[model samples]
Target: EYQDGKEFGIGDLVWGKIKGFSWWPAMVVSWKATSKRQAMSGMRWVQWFGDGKFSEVSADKLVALGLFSQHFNLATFNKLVSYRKAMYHALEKARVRAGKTFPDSLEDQLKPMLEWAHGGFKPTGIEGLKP
Candidate 1:
């Protein structure tokens, strides 16, 4: 009964793409069932983002990619705040390129594009990251 219409289950083939390398493929070997407890499987058990498919990846590799999901600690949550700050900067750069300055009222200026990006306030959590 999760948002995806499928709760985490063992041996389920989930789809995901890596953070920056969106063309890569990663596999979901298992599910943690709950986030209340933690072990070294990188925290978020949903696996990772891949290029339209899935493949098993090592915990070390996942760590190397610097992936972490919002499902775990406050780090990833706060990290999102940082990502937004960068996005705002990049958007402003685009405006500058077009011979204009971005508005101080970013929310109002970004409203239209935000709706197209997603009907939500921000992009969904990083596809699938380890905690």
Candidate 2:
């Protein structure tokens, strides 16, 4: 029961960015409640959209993307549908379950990192203070 109730999750989608770049999609890959290493220090780790790069975001921005959709629009609706596809796709890579896993291996993991750089997987637009 790792329920400290933070905003994002391994499957919960969120927005993030490296400094000097714009906003983009990413999923919270791993985190916990300890000050061990950079990723283990209660600091969350997220992987980028089309890119596969892993970077860290701060607490304020993590909450910034935590939204509830009371108001509405078609574009926003479609954005969610598209985001859902990304979520499932990440899961289907399959080798994820511990018994079948390999070190540093996620099927489509690395390529998307490059996709972020070449005009693919664009982000629209905080910090711990978005893109």
Candidate 3:
């Protein structure tokens, strides 16, 4: 009965993505049962690591990713925050230089940084790598 409808719980790792939005790593901090018709669509407060912000997303929006058995460290979190800030600054410069009316798509804007984050490039015979 604790869940009421949703299955997520405290400290559960998940990837949260909203429609028309980019996905990000998150951890469920708390939840509350709602009076909505679909109880399973209860509200869950999640902390998005990418920006160190808490947002309320529907329980159904969370996809179980994995848990970091307390081995996780703030060092890694700090790295992500630093990288995100740099990426945003670069993108802002590009947007200003190009004189574009709107910002670039998230995928395009983050491509270089994402690749760098994933170790830059995969070996030739590794497969599943960009050429």
TM-score, one value per model: 0.23, 0.39, 0.42
- The model with the greatest lDDT is 3
Q: What's the lDDT for residue 110 in model 1?
A: 50
* Worst 10 contiguous positions by lDDT, candidate 1: 64-73
The models' CA-based lDDT, in order, is 0.32, 0.41, 0.48
Runs in model 3 deviating more than 4 A are: 31-41, 67-131
lDDT of 3 by residue, 28-117 (tens): 664342223322347677766546567777777776542212222335435565435434443333323333223255556665533432
Better of 1 and 2 by TM-score: 2
Clashes (backbone N, CA, C under 3 Å), per candidate, total: 8, 7, 0
Highest TM-score: give the candidate number.
3
Query: Over 4 Å off in model 1, which ranges?
Result: 1-79, 101-131
Estimate the TM-score for candidate 3.
0.42
Q: Root-mean-square deviation of each candidate, in angstroms? A: 14.4, 12.8, 14.9
Higher-scoring candidate on TM-score, 2 or 3: 3
* Poorest lDDT segment (10 consecutive residues) of candidate 2: 122-131
